[PDB]
Structure formats: structure tokens, C-alpha cells
């Protein structure tokens, strides 16, 4: 029945959840390199009234 | 917008269309050959229209429709050069291909893969159109290699025939030497001019040098089967008769001449390359005609005639007459295609017999093919007002009246005489006399397809030269004033060849037997060139490929130097180290020696 389907096809979510976790870890790695954000001579600009950071 | 670009690109696209429909029920049915032929006819008319547009106002254009890639300062784009040469060669090639396709509908009826045959013919036509209309060297090379591989695939049509496979591979080998020359020229042009297109090449090369021009000359010799690289064209007669008629003789072997024509400014600037071109063309036409006059296979005779005409075109280029070369290209396409079709009809009516020794009586046995072949032979030899007269006569007049090589001039005249000789040989041994074929007479030429195709190619062999010569603008200074004997040199040598060959053929009826001469053996056996040059270099290369490279170096010395010697040394050292008797006396004496050495030598 349905229980046997999940018992056999619970492995098909492993790669998708791995991809989601990888995207999350990429965001976490990006958020630690925010040392020159809105500080490069080429891309330095004034912040818009309703924004806190130039990029995330 | 001007219809010129639209109509030219439309002809090319509708040529490409039936290849798309090769994955359909129409391709699975038996209507595909007629469908392809109809498409080619429509393309022919739609290409005739821009030819009319050009012959009025001399309109020429280039179309850089699609940009492929920019290698920093070099831009490669899909560009087509619709000039005089392109708009005059596309309709002629389409006309010839239409006739060949109808003839192949009649001729290949029993072939299980006639649909594949027609798809391959259309693919060859597409690649040839790409080659002719190419505006840059890379697209020209695309068309070059495409016609090369399509020739490879169509020559080896019968995959079970080892001779067909050898012919295909030999054609590939010679065309690859030509491609070596082509790549040399491409590399030089890009390196020294930062361009792969004709406009900038011509702008920057005010005095084109020997290296690029010799590269181009080598490529043209390889593709057009000049001397040294000639044997592949006669060997290409292994393919079906439609292949020989359309691909090789008419439209593909003219690729090298066309390449040399497209660079006529640079050829004009240089002189040593012109001399080399003239000499190569002269020796090619002479040698190929000399081999032709004594062959017994009708397809071989026509192939050698094609090679001789190509040599004449190369002579025309070398005397700095590029436009006469193009005119002769068109005229030769017409009458040589018709000659090949006539020989194919003869072969099919006589149950796959290709020997003039077994033909005979066909003058009355087959009326229409007989009159067509006679007209084609008259056009080939330059009958004073047929299609071949408007090009060959002018070529001979220009050769005699120019500052040329004396030996090249003499060889050109002798080649014209031998052209007349071998045309007489074909007529005499094929149509005149008594039958020599097996008694079961299956001679039948009443097929509307065969008759209509030969009719269409027969009108061109009579009138096309007049129309084409009278409609093109004057692109060269005529030789109005010349001595009477020089004006009549072509006719005199043609008539002398006719008479001498006819007499020598009439002597074959006598009840007299004599063994062949050394000159006869040299002429009949193709000058011994295929024997020596196909047994010696190949044997030496294939022998060194195994005795020296694979066996001596790879399997023996590269194994001995690095991996074997190191392994042997390590094995010997391991045996020395581990071969101990396990005696405390021995290795304690060793300990004593080590202690003494460490005490004395280490301070």
C-alpha cells in the first residue's frame, strides 16, 4: 500500500534535500565574507532609504 | 528590401529543407526521390531569378546574417558572398543536379536505398553551395571538408566492395593533403592579417607572398586532382554513375579551380605562383589526356577527360585569366555531365558492361543517346559554335598571345589534340561497327525520365555558351588582333587529332597482330604512377608504423628505459637485502663495523 511506497521511495528525497542544504551552506559561507560590502571603490554607493545592505 | 539577399538565402534554405523531412513517412515511402527532384527544380528557378537581377545592373552583395564568435580582435560570422561567381555557378549546378537526379531516378530503380542515395546527393549539393557562397575561410573550409566526406560516402556506395572502400580512402588521403595546404594558408592569413574574410584579406595583402599563395595552390591541386595528386579522380569511378556524373566530374573537382579564382587579386599580385600554376596545369592536362587516349573503360576515359579539362582551367588561371576559367567551369559542367549520363545509359542498357571492347552497333541500337554523345563530344573538342567553343577557343587564344612558358604552351596544344583523339576513340569503339555484346539484346532507352534529363542537358550543350557569353559584362580585354594561323590553331590541332586517331582506329580492322610498345604500356598503365606511388610509400609508412614505432620504441625501448630497468634494479637490491642466512655472528660483525665507522667518520 502507501506505507510500502514510502518505505521504498523515501530515498528519492535525499539528493533534493542535499541540494537545499548545499544552497543554505552557500548562503552561510557568503554571509561571512561581508567585510567589503558597499565599500569597494568601484561599487561604493549611498544606501537606499529602505535597504540595510547592498547584497546578501 | 532588395530581393537579392532574400532569394539567394531562400534557394539555399529550400535546398536544405528535404533533409529535415528525412525523418518522416515521406522518407519511408517511395515518393522521396521525386520530392527531392521537385525541390531541386524549384530551387533552380528561384536561383535563376537573382542571376537575371545581376546580369541587368551587376548587383553583388555580402550577407553577414549570423555572428558566430569573436576571438578577441577576430570576428567569425556566418557570411555569404553573393557575387558574379556565386550567382553564375549556383543555377548551373542546380540545373546539372536536377538532370542527374532524374537520371538517377531512372538508373537506381533497383537499389534498395534509393532514398538514402537521394538524401546523400542533396547533402553534397548543400555542401557545394556552402563552399561556393562562402565569404570567409572558415566557412569555405566547412564546405571543402563537407564535399570531401560526401564524396567519401558516395564513392563507397557498395560497402561490400573492397575496391570501393580503397577508392574512398584514397580520395580522402589526397583531399587531406590538399587540406594541409588549406590550413597552412588559413594560419598564415590569420596570423599576418588578423582576418579570415576576403574583404580584409584583399585590403591588407597588396602583395601576397609565396607561403600563403603556395598553400592555396597545393589545396587546389589536391581538390582538383592535378599531377602528383591525380590518381584519386579516375579511381573514384567505383561509385554509381550518377555519383561520377554529378559529384566528381561536374561540380566537385572544380572546387580547387574555384578556390584559386576567388583569390585572383593575390594571384595577380604574385608571379612565381602563377608560373607554378601554369606548369602544373600544363603537365596535368597533357599527362591525363595521354593516359585517356588508350583506356578501355568508358568511365575511366571520361574521368581522364575531366582531369584534362581541369588542367586546362589551371593553365587559364596561370596566364592571369581567372574569368575565362570560370566560364570554362560552367561549360564543362554542362557537356561533361551529359557525357557521363550518356555513358551511364549505355552501361545500364548493356547489363552493367563498362567496356568499349564489348560495346558496338549502338549508333543504330540507341539513337538518342548516340546523338547526345556525339553532340557532347563535339562540344568538348570545341566545335566552332557550340558551348565549349566560347571558352576553350578563348583560352587557347589567350595562351598563345601571352607571355607564357613555351613548354606549357606546347603541352596545352598537344593536350587539345589528344582530347580530340580520345573523343574519337569513345565514339568509334562504342557506336560504330558491329555488335560485340552478348546475344541477348536488352537495349532499351525509351524511358521518359532518361530522355527528358538528357534533353535538358542537351539544350545547354548547344546554346548555353552563347547566352552566357553574351549576357556577362566584359571583364577582360579581348585579343582582337592576331595572326590567322594563331586564330585557327585550336581548330587545326583538333582536326589533326581527329584524323590521326581515326586512322589509327581504322588500322585495328586489319588481320595483323603486333605486340604492344613501351610507349603503349606507359600510356595504358597510367604512366606507372599508381603502381609505384601506391605500393612504395604506403609499404614504407606501414612498415615503419609497426617495426619502428610500435615494436622498436613502444614495446621495447620505452619499456626498457624507464619501467623495466627500475623494476629490475629494485628487484636485485631487494634480493641482496633480504638474502640473509639469519646468523647473529654475521650481523653482529656488521654491527661492529658500523660502530667503528660511525665513531671515526662522524665528528
Amino acid at each position: 500500500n502507501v506505507l510500502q511506497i514510502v518505505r521504498d521511495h523515501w530515498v528519492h528525497i535525499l539528493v533534493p534535500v542535499g541540494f537545499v542544504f548545499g544552497c543554505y551552506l552557500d548562503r552561510r559561507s557568503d554571509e561571512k565574507l561581508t567585510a567589503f560590502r558597499n565599500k569597494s571603490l568601484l561599487f561604493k554607493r549611498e544606501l537606499r532609504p529602505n535597504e540595510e545592505v547592498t547584497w546578501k | 528590401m532588395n530581393p537579392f539577399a532574400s532569394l539567394t538565402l531562400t534557394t539555399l534554405t529550400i535546398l536544405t529543407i528535404p533533409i529535415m523531412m528525412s525523418n518522416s513517412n515521406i522518407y519511408k515511402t517511395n515518393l522521396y526521390p521525386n520530392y527531392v527532384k521537385t525541390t531541386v527544380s524549384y530551387a533552380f528557378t528561384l536561383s535563376l531569378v537573382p542571376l537575371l537581377m545581376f546580369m541587368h545592373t551587376g548587383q553583388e552583395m555580402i550577407i553577414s546574417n549570423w555572428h558566430w564568435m569573436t576571438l578577441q580582435t577576430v570576428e567569425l560570422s556566418l557570411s555569404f558572398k553573393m557575387d558574379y561567381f556565386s550567382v553564375m555557378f549556383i543555377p548551373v549546378a542546380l540545373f546539372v543536379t536536377w538532370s542527374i537526379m532524374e537520371f538517377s531516378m531512372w538508373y537506381m530503380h533497383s537499389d534498395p536505398f534509393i532514398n538514402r542515395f537521394f538524401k546523400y546527393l542533396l547533402l553534397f549539393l548543400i555542401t557545394m553551395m556552402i563552399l561556393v557562397t562562402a565569404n570567409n575561410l572558415f566557412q569555405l573550409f566547412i564546405g571543402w571538408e563537407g564535399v570531401g566526406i560526401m564524396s567519401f560516402l558516395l564513392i563507397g556506395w557498395w560497402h561490400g566492395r573492397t575496391d570501393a572502400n580503397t577508392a574512398a580512402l584514397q580520395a580522402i588521403l589526397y583531399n587531406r593533403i590538399g587540406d594541409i595546404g588549406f590550413v597552412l594558408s588559413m594560419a598564415w592569413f590569420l596570423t599576418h592579417s588578423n582576418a579570415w574574410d576576403l574583404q580584409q584579406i584583399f585590403m591588407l595583402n597588396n602583395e601576397c607572398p609565396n607561403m600563403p599563395l603556395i598553400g592555396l595552390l597545393l589545396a587546389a591541386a589536391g581538390k582538383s586532382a592535378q599531377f602528383g595528386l591525380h590518381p584519386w579522380l579516375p579511381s573514384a569511378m567505383e561509385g554509381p554513375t550518377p555519383v561520377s556524373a554529378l559529384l566528381h566530374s561536374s561540380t566537385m573537382v572544380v572546387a580547387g579551380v574555384f578556390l584559386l579564382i576567388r583569390f585572383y587579386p593575390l594571384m595577380e599580385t604574385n608571379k612565381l605562383v602563377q608560373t607554378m600554376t601554369l606548369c602544373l596545369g600544363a603537365i596535368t592536362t597533357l599527362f591525363t589526356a595521354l593516359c585517356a587516349i588508350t583506356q578501355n573503360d568508358i568511365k575511366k576515359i571520361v574521368a581522364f577527360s575531366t582531369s584534362s579539362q581541369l588542367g586546362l582551367m589551371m593553365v587559364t588561371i596561370g596566364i592571369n585569366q581567372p574569368h575565362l576559367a570560370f566560364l570554362h567551369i560552367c561549360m564543362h559542367a554542362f557537356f561533361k555531365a551529359m557525357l557521363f549520363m550518356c555513358s551511364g545509359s549505355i552501361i545500364h542498357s548493356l547489363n552493367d558492361e563498362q567496356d568499349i571492347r564489348k560495346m558496338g552497333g549502338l549508333y543504330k541500337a540507341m539513337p538518342f543517346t548516340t546523338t547526345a554523345l556525339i553532340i557532347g563530344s563535339l562540344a568538348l573538342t570545341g566545335m566552332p559554335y557550340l558551348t565549349g567553343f566560347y571558352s576553350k577557343d578563348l583560352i587557347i587564344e589567350a595562351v598563345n598571345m601571352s607571355y607564357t612558358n613555351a613548354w606549357a604552351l606546347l603541352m596545352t596544344l598537344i593536350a587539345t589534340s589528344l582530347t580530340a583523339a580520345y573523343s574519337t576513340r569513345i565514339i568509334f569503339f562504342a557506336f560504330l561497327g558491329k555488335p560485340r555484346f552478348p546475344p541477348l539484346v536488352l537495349i532499351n532507352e525509351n524511358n521518359p525520365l532518361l530522355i527528358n534529363s538528357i534533353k535538358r542537358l542537351l539544350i545547354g550543350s548547344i546554346f548555353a555558351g552563347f547566352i552566357i557569353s553574351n549576357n556577362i559584362p566584359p571583364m577582360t580585354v579581348p585579343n582582337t588582333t592576331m595572326p590567322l594561323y594563331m586564330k585557327m590553331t585550336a581548330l587545326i590541332v583538333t582536326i589533326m587529332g581527329f584524323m590521326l586517331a581515326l586512322e589509327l582506329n581504322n588500322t585495328t580492322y586489319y588481320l595483323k597482330f603486333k605486340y604492344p610498345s613501351q610507349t603503349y604500356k606507359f600510356s595504358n598503365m597510367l604512366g606507372y604512377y599508381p603502381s609505384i606511388m601506391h605500393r612504395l610509400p604506403t609499404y614504407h609508412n606501414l612498415s615503419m608504423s609497426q617495426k619502428s614505432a610500435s615494436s622498436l620504441l613502444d614495446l621495447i625501448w620505452l619499456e626498457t628505459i624507464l619501467p623495466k630497468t627500475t623494476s629490475f634494479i629494485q628487484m636485485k637490491m631487494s634480493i641482496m637485502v633480504s638474502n640473509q642466512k639469519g646468523l647473529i655472528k654475521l650481523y653482529f660483525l656488521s654491527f661492529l663495523i658500523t660502530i667503528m665507522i660511525s665513531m671515526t667518520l662522524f665528528n
Binding site: D8, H12, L25 | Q72, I149, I180, V183, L184, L542, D554
Partner: protein
């Protein structure tokens, strides 16, 4: 790069937890999905690389190699499921595990940002390959082949490790960005000569260089089909990638030290083409063709001009795809007749039409046929070598002629002629085999349509 690294490390438990008959389906489907995800790396910048973090970065040279690796994994899965039908479930899962580990190591190798991490990963790629060869090979010579492959690569790579740690002690960092910005000229001294030799010789053995290449025929002939596919398609490209990376710090000494390697590469290109002319084994013929093409790539990297680097990258990608396709075709023939001799089976065009078409297309791409990316790369390399010197054109022309000769000779021998009479077990081609050939060939033509994606950073 974690969005691509983690799904492979999840391919591992999924393969080990899936049912006994769903392993191939799951592995193939999710490998294809990972390849689709990795296609997003081709969007590169014109100024600098894609700096994901302190550990992984992507460039116009790394991106196509990653896409090729990720696309190559499912094809190896299809071939493996062809030839491993009677294996036990645990051994099938171990085979898939070795393939997955190899792919993960290759991905991290191409995306590593330090030379030392690159070294560690590109040396870690040897273990799965050696296990695959020496465990699932068919014949006896697989053991000797594994020994040759392993010891050639390690004898090449150990001086590279010493040189890398020395360079880090000397300059302070092995990060590729830092060593590109803080590069200094290399003086002509014996010490610099031997540092140059250490690095270059490691990657030349990995290429391989002519005279250092016997392990390549040994390993490629005796490995299973998946091992042969990965060895030729990707593992030969680690040497080229490494040479295109390390030569930043070896100038101007490369101008003087490249003569022996250029002469070896050109003459060995000629020699290996000639060897291909007289080969009695199909796999050996394909292996020596690989040697010739990689010799051309070595020439490009050594002459080291912007036109040569683009040609090197294009030729690397094209050769990977073409050699993989050729190995697959030879393996299908082998599975028919259980022998590798070229003249044993003939008439395969009259017995198997569509396979004859695939053979024709693959052989046409093996020789430089325009406008294929094979020709694009070879032509760029030839042009750069012509600007280098004007007899390189002679050598390149000879090589092109012989390449066409042996490719068409292989096609004519295997396909054309009359069928062998006593071989009556040649069953019709499988949909799996036909799909494998299609998946090899269609991306190559699409790359021909869009050629700027595989021309490297110098474009």
C-alpha cells in the same frame, strides 16, 4: 559549490539504501539531475572568476570540465549496468560507490582554490580508479595495468608535492589568486630549472607525454567500460588543467624549458598516429588516438599564447566526449563477440545499421571535421603553433592526414565488407546502447552551435 558537492555525498546513502532493482534507476536519475544543476556554472564573468568561498572557486576553465564530469557519470552508469548484470547487490553498490567517489573527487579537484588542496584531491582520484581497474577488469593484465598507472602517476606527483610545500614556504601562500597577483619572474638558475621540472613533469605524466605514456594503453585497454570512459574523458584533463594553472609562476623560464617537451609532443603525436595505423586491437587504437590528441594539447599549453589556450580547452572537451563515445561503441561490439580484435567481426553495417551510423558520426568527429569543436580546438592550436614557428604547420598537417587515415581505416574495417560467417550471436542493438550513443553525440553538436562556452577564460 556545496550545492553540487552535497548532492553527490547524498548519492552515496541513496545508492546504499535503495532496493536491489532500483539502484540503477535512482543513480541515473539523480546523476542527470545533478548534471542539470551543474549546468548553471557556465555563467561566468569577463573580469574575474566566481569566488564562492575561501575554499572553492570556478572559472571559465573549470566550469566546462565540471559539466563534462557531471554529464559523464550517468553514461558510465548505463554502460556499467550493461556489463554487470550477474553481479551481487553489494558489489553493484560498491561499483556505483566507486564511481560516485571518483566524481566527487573530480569536482572538488576542478574547484579547489589552493594548489595543495588541488594536489590532495587529484591524487585522491587514483584510489577509486585503481580499485575499479584491478577489481572489475576482465583480463589478466588488469593487475599489471593498475601497477603501471599507479606508479607512473605517483612518481610524477611526489616531486610536485615537494615543490608545492617549498613554494608555500618561499612565498607565503598557495592560493591561486594570490600567486597570480603576487607572481614574480623566475630567474635562470639550476634551482628554478628543477622546480619547473618537478611541477611540469608531474602534470606531463598525468597528460601523458610521449615517452611517459605506456601506462595509458595498459590501463585503458584493461579497465572496464566505465573505467575506460572516465580515464579518457576526464582523468587525462587533470594534467592539462594543472599545467594551465601552475604555469603562472614558471615564467619566463617556460620560454627556454619548453623545447624538449615541444619536440617530444610533436614527434610523439606523429608516432602515435602511425602506431594507430597498424593496431590489431580496437581499444589500443582508441587509446593511442587519445595520446595523439593530448600531445597536441601539450604543445598548445607549452607555446602558451591566448589563441593556444582556447584551442587547448576546446580540444580537451571535444576529445573527452569523442573518446568516451568511441570506447562505448567498442564495448558494445565486444559484448557481442567477447573479443577486442578489430578484424574478428566485420559487416556490422549490414548486420546493425544504426550502430553503423553512430560509428560514422563518432569517427567523423574523431578527425577534425568542421565545424566541430574538435576542429575548432585543433585549428586554434595549429594557428598558434604557426605563429610560434613555420614548420609546426608541416608536423600538424602530417598529423591531420594520419588521423583521418586511421579513423576511416577503423570505420572501414569494423563496419564495411562482408560479415563473418560463423558469428551468429549478433543480436539487434539495444535501446540502452542507442540512447548512450545519442547522449554522447548530441551535446557535441550543441557545443558546436555555441562555441564560446568551452573556449576558456582567454575568450
Amino acid at each position: 559549490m556545496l550545492k553540487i558537492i552535497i548532492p553527490t555525498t547524498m548519492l552515496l546513502p541513496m545508492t546504499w539504501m535503495s532496493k536491489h532493482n532500483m539502484i540503477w534507476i535512482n543513480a541515473t536519475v539523480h546523476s542527470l539531475l545533478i548534471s542539470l544543476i551543474s549546468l548553471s556554472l557556465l555563467n561566468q564573468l569577463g573580469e574575474n572568476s566566481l569566488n564562492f568561498s575561501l575554499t572553492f572557486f570556478s572559472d571559465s576553465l573549470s566550469a566546462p570540465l565540471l559539466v563534462l564530469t557531471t554529464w559523464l557519470l550517468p553514461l558510465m552508469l548505463m554502460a556499467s549496468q550493461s556489463h554487470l548484470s550477474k553481479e551481487t547487490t553489494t558489489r553493484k553498490k560498491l561499483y556505483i560507490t566507486m564511481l560516485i567517489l571518483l566524481q566527487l573527487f573530480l569536482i572538488m579537484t576542478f574547484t579547489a582554490t589552493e594548489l595543495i588542496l588541488f594536489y590532495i584531491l587529484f591524487e585522491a582520484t587514483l584510489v577509486p580508479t585503481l580499485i575499479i581497474i584491478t577489481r572489475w577488469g576482465n583480463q589478466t593484465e588488469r593487475l599489471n595495468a593498475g601497477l603501471y598507472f599507479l606508479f607512473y602517476t605517483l612518481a610524477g606527483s611526489l616531486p610536485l608535492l615537494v615543490a608545492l610545500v617549498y613554494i608555500q614556504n618561499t612565498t607565503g601562500s598557495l592560493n591561486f589568486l594570490i600567486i597570480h597577483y603576487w607572481s614574480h619572474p623566475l630567474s635562470n638558475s639550476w634551482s628554478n630549472i628543477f622546480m619547473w621540472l618537478a611541477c611540469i613533469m608531474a602534470f606531463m605524466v598525468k597528460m601523458p607525454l610521449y615517452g611517459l605514456h605506456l601506462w595509458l594503453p595498459k590501463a585503458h585497454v584493461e579497465a572496464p567500460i566505465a573505467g575506460s570512459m572516465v580515464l579518457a574523458a576526464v582523468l587525462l584533463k587533470l594534467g592539462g588543467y594543472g599545467m594551465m594553472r601552475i604555469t603562472t609562476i614558471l615564467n619566463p623560464l617556460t620560454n627556454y624549458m619548453a623545447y624538449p617537451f615541444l619536440m617530444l609532443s610533436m614527434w610523439g603525436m606523429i608516432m602515435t598516429s602511425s602506431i594507430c595505423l597498424r593496431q590489431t586491437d580496437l581499444k589500443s587504437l582508441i587509446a593511442y588516438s587519445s595520446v595523439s590528441h593530448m600531445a597536441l594539447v601539450i604543445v598548445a599549453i607549452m607555446i602558451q599564447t591566448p589563441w593556444s589556450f582556447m584551442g587547448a580547452t576546446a580540444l580537451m572537451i571535444a576529445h573527452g566526449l569523442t573518446s568516451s563515445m568511441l570506447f562505448c561503441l567498442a564495448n558494445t561490439n565486444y559484448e557481442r563477440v567477447h573479443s577486442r580484435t578489430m578484424i574478428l567481426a566485420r559487416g556490422l553495417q549490414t548486420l546493425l545499421p544504426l550502430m553503423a551510423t553512430w560509428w560514422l558520426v563518432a569517427s567523423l568527429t574523431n578527425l577534425a571535421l568542421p565545424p566541430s569543436i574538435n576542429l575548432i580546438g585543433e585549428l586554434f592550436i595549429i594557428t598558434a603553433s604557426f605563429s610560434w614557428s613555420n614548420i609546426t604547420i608541416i608536423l600538424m598537417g602530417m598529423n591531420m592526414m594520419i588521423t583521418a587515415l586511421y579513423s576511416l581505416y577503423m570505420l572501414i574495417t569494423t563496419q564495411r565488407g562482408k560479415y563473418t560467417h560463423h558469428i551468429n550471436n549478433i543480436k539487434p542493438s539495444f535501446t540502452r546502447e542507442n540512447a548512450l550513443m545519442a547522449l554522447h553525440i548530441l551535446p557535441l553538436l550543441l557545443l558546436t552551435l555555441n562555441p564560446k562556452m568551452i573556449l576558456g577564460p582567454l575568450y
